[PDB]
Design a binder for this molecule. Sequence first.
Ligand code: MG
Ligand code: MG
Ligand code: MG
Ligand code: MG
Lengths: 456, 461
Amino acid sequence: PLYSSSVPANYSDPQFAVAVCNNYLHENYPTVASYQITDEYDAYLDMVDGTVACLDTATFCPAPNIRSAVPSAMQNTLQNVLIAATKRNRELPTLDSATFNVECFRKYACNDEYWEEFARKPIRITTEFVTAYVARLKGPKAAALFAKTYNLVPLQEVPMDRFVMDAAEPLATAYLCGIHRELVRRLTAVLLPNIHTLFDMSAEDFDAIIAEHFKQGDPVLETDIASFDKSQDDAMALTGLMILEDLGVDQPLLDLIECAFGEISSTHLPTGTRFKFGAMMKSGMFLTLFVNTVLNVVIASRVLEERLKTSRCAAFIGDDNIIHGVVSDKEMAERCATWLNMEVKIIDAVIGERPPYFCGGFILQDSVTSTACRVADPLKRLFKLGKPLPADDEQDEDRRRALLDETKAWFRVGITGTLAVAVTTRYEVDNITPVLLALRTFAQSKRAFQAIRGEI
Amino acid sequence: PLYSSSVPANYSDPQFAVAVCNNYLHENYPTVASYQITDEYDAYLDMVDGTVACLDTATFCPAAPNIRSAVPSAMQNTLQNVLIAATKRNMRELPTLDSATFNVECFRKYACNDEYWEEFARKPIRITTEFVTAYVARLKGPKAAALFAKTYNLVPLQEVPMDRFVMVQVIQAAEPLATAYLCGIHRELVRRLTAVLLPNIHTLFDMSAEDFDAIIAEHFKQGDPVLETDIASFDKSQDDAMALTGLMILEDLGVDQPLLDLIECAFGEISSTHLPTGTRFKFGAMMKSGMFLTLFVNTVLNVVIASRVLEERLKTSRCAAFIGDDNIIHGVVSDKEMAERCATWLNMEVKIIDAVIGERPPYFCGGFILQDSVTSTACRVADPLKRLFKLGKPLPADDEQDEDRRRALLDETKAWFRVGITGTLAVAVTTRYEVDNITPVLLALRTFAQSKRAFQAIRGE
Ligand SMILES: [Mg+2]
Ligand SMILES: [Mg+2]
Ligand SMILES: [Mg+2]
Ligand SMILES: [Mg+2]
């Protein structure tokens, strides 16, 4: 209870205090990063109904939705990848673990045809892309103004010294969007054709893949990595950096990525009254989702080994996956246990009995067509609809149309019964069908949907 | 692919659909519970700067600067899962009973005296007329308390019969009575836990910053080792043996079956208030009651985990402090046997951290345990990096809350600028996070705190 005398000091202007706080966070990124960044990720993903729907309806950097009512819990994977990059430019135990991880990823998930190309051809964004990026935002005229203003020479890579920031942020935002598009394209090239990602895939196109490969009685395996804080794991971060490098993210690109994203850290104050959801925000969130998907595949590669390679159909996006035709064994369980302790668990599901789960939905067999499909989880949706929300007529209509789309799937005459069975099987709850009927009531009109929020 | 034809299907009255959703969640509690409940817990706790500040400044159910934390709350529904364990209780799950019974043995042997269990077993918790009247008198004055007592036919010097507010469903005309009753349960649970815990084991259910600093000062010296068990990654709320451990210790403290029935009945009704949502969380007394009970069980399981991992080293520690998921244990250093006990039991979901006063600062409730370089006396100082992170939250205008937040920041900056604190705090922040000298941030936050006009620069516009 003996405190020394307190003598506070301060700056002569609050704007000095703002700049000092922003500058401090800028200078100390990536070592630390504000949790407001991932809170903003969660808020955006929750508002657009999750990862796949966010990627599929991307307004700034594109390429019925797959919608999930599961709350987002994003961690700053990209921050820790950049921490690994700084540490690389002793812990050879980490290096040997990450190297083995990359070996498993290549051996069991990838072809080997493209690594030489990507090594000699790092990712570089061109004038034509960033112009077409601005053209789709504001029209052909504003893009030619954009190319003239930055002195962009046609058919040339955008010079990196044209816009580095270690205010031309429109150019930097356009460049980062080109990086994400090329990363998705290059990852799609290396992955074996039975291994699918969902960076831009509608519910109908994914359902075509499910319908083709998933039959009644088929086992489906899931690796649950929700409890594994891979974003704060040293070997995972180095694995992510290593595979990004293999895909063409060289040191100039890494420097550009760290420079651009240190600038987000500097937009801490003033806060405003709501998350601004910038286009730069979305680029960082997209890159985080990309690395998470890769690490998801890496974990499945190391745990399943050849059983992943020979799977007839395996799908990955964010932290979620399903792997057809694989049943856990004890060699598999020991590998997963000795490597990641109980941070990652293996789930054995079966089409028609113990339903597989994927992106907040059930993999169900339609009882009329005998065709498998993904159906959104109605219990999660009901939970999500309880969120108190300020009045917003345009967003209310968006949410109502999303509910309408979901209820149309629930009331397919081959789905309603097996969906209620799956919900009771997964959660041990009573028959969900009265809630299905209630939610469809809300969905059919703007007036009925208003009952969810209530008066005032 | 191929979809069967969709024949969508609805009700006519939207109010009927509301009732169906509410009744469904009511009927299927505790089996499932909406995450809106724990999102509301987090929102309330973040608003009032965390667990200790929330209990220390409890508006409805309480017993100077507060122990405030800028660490975001991530609450789980521990009380839900205790009630599931109660349902499961009323042989294939024998290992669960074996594990939870061993947990309670460890809790009793290494954290408790043995004096009170017989009394609590024959005297279950029952709340009396005098408490609920005094509860209402504190809230609305002695006139309203007498009105309250007369309305419910409360007989003085007598326990409140549970048939006055629960028929098992809560009489809605007697909801104020039920909330007053649950506040009495929390106060008695805190009293009885304090009775059984060894005197060197402290909880912070009602402790000011000054009072806790007095305990830190007496016991924590320069160079003293301080152990922490990190259970933040341990999802003890959906662990079967943890939930059953919490149930049995509640029972050992006097929560018998009628009391459990009341608790499940009252909080199942909360599940039936899912819709309509309104525009913001309403908070309110029944929400706070369930949150306090969750914090209580979490604190107990926190002590349980330390008991089983540390064994006699918890018992002989000169000072161990617990609240929520956080703890510090004076004078203990991890060893191989301890790490193996922890890993074998909870498989690297609980981490043991070795701290040292003055070199690697112990961390507790979003603050550092530091030795004042001038008084040579140890104390807790709030983490300035966490506070900086928290101030970045975009917030709608609220003149009253803005002044509350500015005044709390003023108190925090006062500790940071004690002439014996600033230096070792900068070193501690750099040691913990590997960041540059935090002192410019200390000055910037003090700038915001000095006036309402300066504080407006955080939100801007
Ligand atoms: Mg390489
Ligand atoms: Mg999964
Ligand atoms: Mg007992
Ligand atoms: Mg701790």
